[PDB]
Symmetry: C6
Subunit: 103 residues, 6 copies
């Protein structure tokens, strides 16, 4: 059960920047995003914990350079419990299977 | 009915941190989460009341240590009424039945 | 047409506490809850007006003891009009029929 | 087209109070409500314009007397255009046809 | 491709007033409304640009006289691009075809 | 992958103004919009990076000239990753294929 990383920002441009920087910085899979409310958006990624760590640093840096975006909150869980993956939207899916493989 | 615990924070990373810490700290089942609005998220758990208490303390501590997350509100109900379980999203489901058995 | 009681708080933990205290304090049926927006939640109950009054007092007290919850607004209508029950989500349903009977 | 009245408050208890007072005060039909966002709720009524006026005054008074509720905005349109009735949620429906006949 | 006008206010009563004033002031079609979030509502209309201009003035005046309503933002586009009409909800539909004809 | 541009404003009239100015200023395709919450709207465009840049400048100028609208945030990604296009709503669709061909 690979690590999960999650980041949230105000505004969609910021989450787009975060997502592109994250997948290019580490061997990770973007497994989903959330329209969280109040114009906040969440991005969730999976991979080896070191890859998630590097991607997260790059996603934070990308948001901070995006005009009008700000990092609100973020976390990395190295070994998420099966119950967590079953309930929260952080599991894999066929749409992202091509990018799990390369990862 | 087994006890129910509920915790709410601003932001999804905080509820993810709470969820993982809670299920690792006690013999509980995560039965659901809520996108509450205004970027707040709710997590609901079930189990024996002492296990829920231990899990809740671990969930609060996890949120406190998560950047940008704060505990907004929480509660533990030791013996929720059947009408409450039937109307509010705190009941078990097939998706979490493997974790109820392990917990139970 | 039995009385209707409605209470709203900030946060789901508060509405869970209110709902449990209300059904245990009076011979009432919880007929629904609303995700009202802005993290506010509504609970609606039905029963004899005296039972709704007692339940409401217990629901208010429960919210006030819940960490981080606050009562935003509440009302009791003793004899709601049929047009009100038809349009607003305060009618009974099969999911709650078991608890209407005992009530 | 019969007149339309619309009232909005913060919180569902307030719109419940307005709804009951309005239909009891005048020969009107409640045709719908809206979860408007930010915990605001809208109620829309129809009927003869004098009946809508009497109902609106009773709805405002009910909200004023409901704890935690305040009247945010309201309007009465005496003769709404057919294109308005067709696009906005202010038309009658089978669910309220028994109350339109009683009102009419 | 006829002009499009868009107006947004806080509260549904204001958008109802705007919509009625707009269709009565000009030879326009109301093509939709949006629950935009935060209790804001959008109204979108189409027609000859001069008709849209007159309707918009009447919709603004109607909102300003509605108790508790306020104009938040508005725009008129005289000749909207086909790509805009395809993506944004400002095109015609069967529900409003009767009122396009008269217009 | 062609470049992606994204812009966000408060209110729908502002995103309508941005959309029209953007597609008229550059060889771009509008691929979608988002009702982001809190009355904010997002517009997403695709095309060659120089065309996206020209369009973005025109979109910002349009929003600046629209009453009650302000540019809240925007970005341009020259070469978005395939996993980004597959998960976020920035890909082409049949609805806009006539405008992709004209743009391409």
């Amino acid at each position: 059960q690979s690590a999960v990383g999650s980041i949230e920002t105000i505004g969609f441009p910021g989450i787009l920047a975060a997502a592109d920087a994250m997948v290019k910085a580490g061997r990770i899979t973007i497994v989903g995003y959330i329209r969280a409310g109040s114009a906040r958006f969440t991005l969730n990624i999976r991979g080896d914990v070191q890859e998630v760590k590097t991607a997260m640093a790059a996603g934070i840096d990308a948001i901070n350079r995006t005009e009008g975006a700000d990092v609100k909150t973020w976390v990395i869980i190295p070994r998420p419990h099966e119950n967590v993956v079953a309930v929260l939207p952080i599991d894999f899916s066929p749409e992202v299977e091509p990018f799990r493989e390369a990862a």
